[PDB]
Design a protein around this ligand. Structure first.
Ligand code: U7D
Ligand code: U7D
Length: 281
């Protein structure tokens, strides 16, 4: 009902406001000293900026469409909004994959790491991930795929029951490839860590990997689950409101999840953040 949407809009603000300050603190700690690590600050800053841009260019419209005004709207509006949201999510996912690959290439082959990842390669990778996120995303602005308004949830989401090919492409580009790459890159790291632990001391390494995988799955899976289920059965009259509310709740949790998982778990970055926070407070 109206109260349910009001509650959803009210609770959608606190998470985003906390993520905003967390991302700003991370930005300050990462930009104060540019000569940090090696061809990594660029990747972390790219993830941070594609999180902040999504936050600031997505939150106002998503909150304002729930207010009981200008109900008619126009298909073009949410059509362009969903494209922006998908572009930002795809950029974040591709940066995530690149960061995971770099982490695996750093853990394994510790000797000839500098000769394989130069500044030119990092900049080319950043340009490539942005180009892919721009190009491969947003077909429906000109082709297959369409968004529409729903008088049940009124989120003006895209209907997957019209172009199965685009739904399949989004599904594979969302979960399959990133999950496979992450599992393949992390299994070897876990085996090497286990070995090193056995050599040194003649279960700690599994917690971090489990946390990363579980966080990514909890952030991204339900949306793909809903998209896959939409093709067979209807969604307007077959799904309760609370389920859609929880799905749209969990979709935006990645904004707060990413900085904690990838900035606060690093020892040096955590130390410097704590140092700055204690100095200011
Ligand atoms: C009237 C009514 C009917 C059903 N549930 C509630 N919510 C309650 S008691 N606490 C609550 C507050 C904010 C968020 C949540 C969350 F959904 F995140 F768990 C729960 C209220
Ligand atoms: C307060 C008020 C008074 C009069 N009209 C509106 N706008 C309406 S109904 N739809 C609308 C909203 C945003 C963009 C567009 C677009 F131009 F892109 F089609 C259309 C709002």
């Amino acid at each position: 009902s109206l109260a349910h949407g009001i509650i959803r809009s009210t609770v959608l603000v606190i998470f985003l406001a906390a993520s905003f300050v967390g991302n700003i603190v991370l930005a300050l700690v990462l930009q104060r000293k540019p000569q940090l690590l090696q061809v990594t600050n660029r990747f972390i800053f790219n993830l941070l900026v594609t999180d902040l841009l999504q936050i600031s260019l997505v939150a106002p419209w998503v909150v304002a469409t729930s207010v009981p005004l200008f109900w008619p709207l126009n298909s073009h509006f949410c059509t362009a909004l969903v494209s922006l949201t998908h572009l930002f999510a795809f950029a974040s996912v591709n940066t995530i994959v690149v960061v995971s690959v770099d982490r695996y290439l750093s853990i394994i082959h510790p000797l000839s790491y500098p000769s394989k990842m130069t500044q030119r390669r990092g900049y080319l990778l950043l340009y490539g991930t942005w180009i892919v996120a721009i190009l491969q995303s947003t077909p429906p602005l000109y082709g297959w795929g369409q968004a529409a308004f729903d008088e049940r949830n009124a989120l003006c989401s895209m209907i997957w029951g019209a172009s199965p090919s685009y739904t399949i492409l989004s599904v594979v580009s969302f979960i399959v490839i990133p999950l496979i790459v992450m599992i393949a890159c992390y299994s070897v790291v876990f085996c090497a860590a286990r070995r090193q632990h056995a050599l040194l001391y003649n279960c700690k390494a599994a917690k971090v990997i489990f946390i990363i995988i579980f966080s990514y799955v909890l952030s991204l899976g339900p949306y793909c689950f809903l998209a896959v289920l939409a093709v067979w059965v209807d969604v307007e009259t077959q799904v309760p409101q609370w389920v859609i509310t929880i799905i749209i709740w969990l979709f935006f949790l990645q904004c707060c999840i990413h900085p904690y998982v990838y900035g606060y778990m690093h020892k040096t970055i955590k130390k410097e953040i704590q140092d700055m926070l204690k100095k200011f407070f």
